[PDB]
Design a protein around this ligand. Sequence first.
Ligand SMILES: *[C@@H]1O[C@H](CO)[C@@H](O[C@@H]2O[C@H](CO)[C@@H](O)[C@H](O)[C@H]2NC(C)=O)[C@H](O)[C@H]1NC(C)=O
Ligand SMILES: *[C@@H]1O[C@H](CO)[C@@H](O[C@@H]2O[C@H](CO)[C@@H](O)[C@H](O)[C@H]2NC(C)=O)[C@H](O)[C@H]1NC(C)=O
Ligand SMILES: CCCCCCCCCCCCCCCC(=O)O
Ligand SMILES: CCCCCCCCCCCCCCCC(=O)O
Lengths: 434, 434
Amino acid sequence: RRAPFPDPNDDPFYKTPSNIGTYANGQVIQSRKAPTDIGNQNGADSFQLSYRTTNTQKEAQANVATVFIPSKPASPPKIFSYQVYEDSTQLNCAPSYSYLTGFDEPNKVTTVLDTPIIISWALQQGYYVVSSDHEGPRSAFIAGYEEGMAILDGIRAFKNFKNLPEDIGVGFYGYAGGAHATAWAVSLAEGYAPEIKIDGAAYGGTPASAKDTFTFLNKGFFAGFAVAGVSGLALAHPDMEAFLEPRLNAKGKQVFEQIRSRGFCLPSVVLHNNFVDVFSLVNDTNLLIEEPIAGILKQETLVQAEASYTVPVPKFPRFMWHALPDEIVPFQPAANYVKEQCQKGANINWNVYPIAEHVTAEIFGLVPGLDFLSKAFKGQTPKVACGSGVPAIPGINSPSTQNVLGSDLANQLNSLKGQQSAFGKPFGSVSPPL
Amino acid sequence: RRAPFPDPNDDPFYKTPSNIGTYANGQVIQSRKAPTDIGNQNGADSFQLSYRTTNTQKEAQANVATVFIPSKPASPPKIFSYQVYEDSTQLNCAPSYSYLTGFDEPNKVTTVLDTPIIISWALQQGYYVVSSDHEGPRSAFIAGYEEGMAILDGIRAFKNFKNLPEDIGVGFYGYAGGAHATAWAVSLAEGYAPEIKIDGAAYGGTPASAKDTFTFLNKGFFAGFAVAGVSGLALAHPDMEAFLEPRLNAKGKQVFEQIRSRGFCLPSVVLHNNFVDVFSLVNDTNLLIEEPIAGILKQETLVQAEASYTVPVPKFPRFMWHALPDEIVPFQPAANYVKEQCQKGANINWNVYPIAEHVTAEIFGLVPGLDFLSKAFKGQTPKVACGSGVPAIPGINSPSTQNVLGSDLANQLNSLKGQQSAFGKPFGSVSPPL
Ligand SMILES: *[C@@H]1O[C@H](CO)[C@@H](O[C@@H]2O[C@H](CO)[C@@H](O)[C@H](O)[C@H]2NC(C)=O)[C@H](O)[C@H]1NC(C)=O
Ligand SMILES: *[C@@H]1O[C@H](CO)[C@@H](O[C@@H]2O[C@H](CO)[C@@H](O)[C@H](O)[C@H]2NC(C)=O)[C@H](O)[C@H]1NC(C)=O
Ligand SMILES: CCCCCCCCCCCCCCCC(=O)O
Ligand SMILES: CCCCCCCCCCCCCCCC(=O)O
């Protein structure tokens, strides 16, 4: 069975009406039921929402998000916002289209692997689920402001549409390209959507800096992502599009046309431009140094050491993970982001997998991150030193005192509780406070 | 019942013979059985060993260590070196004396609280136990070279005395002042005792920098430790003793006399000089700036950013912990040490307790650290990114996939193993490699 809906390029549902400027951010333009594999597998209604959002230039535009409605909602109610690693600069790769039933949707890989297990879990807990087309109508992959505002306005639209309490607690999940959009949504939340109440966010494989991810990727096997990211920023930064187009050589012109063309989604992106140099595509090898790109890159980062703006520092419980030898998305800018955030007051539970890559870490931290989000929805995330994980605690995340010490010495140790230590302050228990 | 042995000050066993220069480092000068509470409680023989070591000026001197001999040794055999937080600059506070039976030993608090539970565990696993008088005959508290060489030569003496295989695996434990001596022993091991085979070390509450610990402590409730540390360095640095003595005022002269006097051990040290300023004791407020102390402090640190020498970087499995709000021993120099070591190739499993103090963290990380040392003796310490702990892993240190996801979604997730991810590389399992 083929997609139940027209190609988004051919569907007026995705067009931005001329009166768009008169809708408020988050206001619903229209809605429609949407046949989705996930909605079917959980007996949950699914819908598409057209709604107004704001692009990088601060101009109104219309966008689509997908909402799943759990059969038995949890009380009090929660919204779970799942961010897809769309990783494409073509409109028919969007999450909404890829959630539909059928077999031929070109980016279906981004919604049928771990995505359904993750969105199912949230629905089986009673959470309301939104997943926006975070790249927006301009398909602007890794454009942080574009993704951020679109995700948050997607949540406002979910709240407007199902008339949910203005203070419903929201939680975010995303990996890889989904983690970039997630990271920017929570970064922008305070400044752009202060009325959204965020209980928690779990994200991993995070591209913290657009510039550092480009350098890490260029000339490598996954250089096709560097092409994709250049295409995406240019679609959200028309001054960079204007700077790039006259610099594209004969080959470069055809490369970007291919990466913006219908059906060229994530599976295509990683099967093309392997080992290519983006600089080979353009006459200028000085593009990173010259304006406007040099300034844009200073905007398109969350690392304060590179940013030309004061980076926001979200305070709610956060859970982040990353493969140390990640071969697609570099570990160190994510580590630098975590450190910076922590020195300014963040609550980041940081999880570094030593023997992992981008793909294996996508699963490794999946279950802990959802567990963490379940606790965040209950206001019960564990206490951690920011930028670390929970330390070793007998009976909780490491062997019991009995298992390690045996019964006698475990009773001796237990009975030091309350007795004077050599430092004149009393001993505590083997377990830190819960 | 009073101590079975004379006061160390009155016992020729502790004196350094005139022929000391003809003994090699680690060579046993003499031995004797020693009645110890710990040795009694485990049915294990205990002995004292007199043995040659090297002081900070590179001069031979004699020292005492205490060895416990498990009834049924483990095979292959291991040595467990336990470092005591003696925290005194008086000879009758030494660990050896405090291990003896009786009630009046003045530093007995340093050997009857967690110390017996820790040394018992090692004996019940079949490990050979040494605990040196790491401060040496000059009672030089937090003098790192003095403590390091004394601990390692104590191990050589244990090996010489019980004729143990030259490649017996050694493991180290220590907290607080014990962690400082431990930290310096492993730092010096390669350069000074390359023939010692180290399987692992677990230490916490570590004073990394003598200078930073002084500043952190001075004028606070525990300023008495700052007095003690000044006394200890001066006892291992005679040029600093010569600089200090003519600067001691009428009060200062009596303060240091009290802190060097018989029976003035850890319980006294924390009951005296509360809120005192060390600068008030001396005419000169410029002592940290002036020589020789300024240079000595640059030697008496493990933080490369302060050191005037290339700090060693041990490579064997290490486990370190620290209370983030530690009020006696500052967290940040220990964190800086860990970071520096990690950037140069260390294997440090780093554990930061967020809701803890110096005393509570003394227990919190006790059981994990001994567990870690059991694994290190088996060559089975877990893999960690250096400077972090093991990240969250379902079924191992966090809830099971079944517990978090339920049975269905846990089977869906499990069955992604081996299937292509959206990135064209296959998925792995929920559990990282063991
Ligand atoms: C590569 O092509 C670009 C695209 O035109 C060239 O850009 C122009 O350079 C001239 C001379 O410096 C300027 O007056 C124009 O304004 C530029 N046009 C722009 C901004 O697109 C460029 O000279 C060529 N060479 C390199 C290495 O960049
Ligand atoms: C405090 O007492 C010290 C101890 O003597 C004084 O030190 C001497 O200072 C003179 C003049 O600078 C030198 O010639 C001597 O060599 C110093 N003796 C030493 C090194 O102990 C010192 O002047 C006094 N004042 C301060 C603030 O330190
Ligand atoms: C000339 C360069 C200017 C702009 C370069 C910015 C490109 C950023 C790099 C692309 C991001 C790819 C992220 C990987 C996708 C994923 O892991 O999901
Ligand atoms: C004028 C100052 C020069 C030398 C100052 C060095 C003093 C170092 C500080 C003392 C260390 C105390 C460590 C705490 C003991 C423990 O926690 O076990």
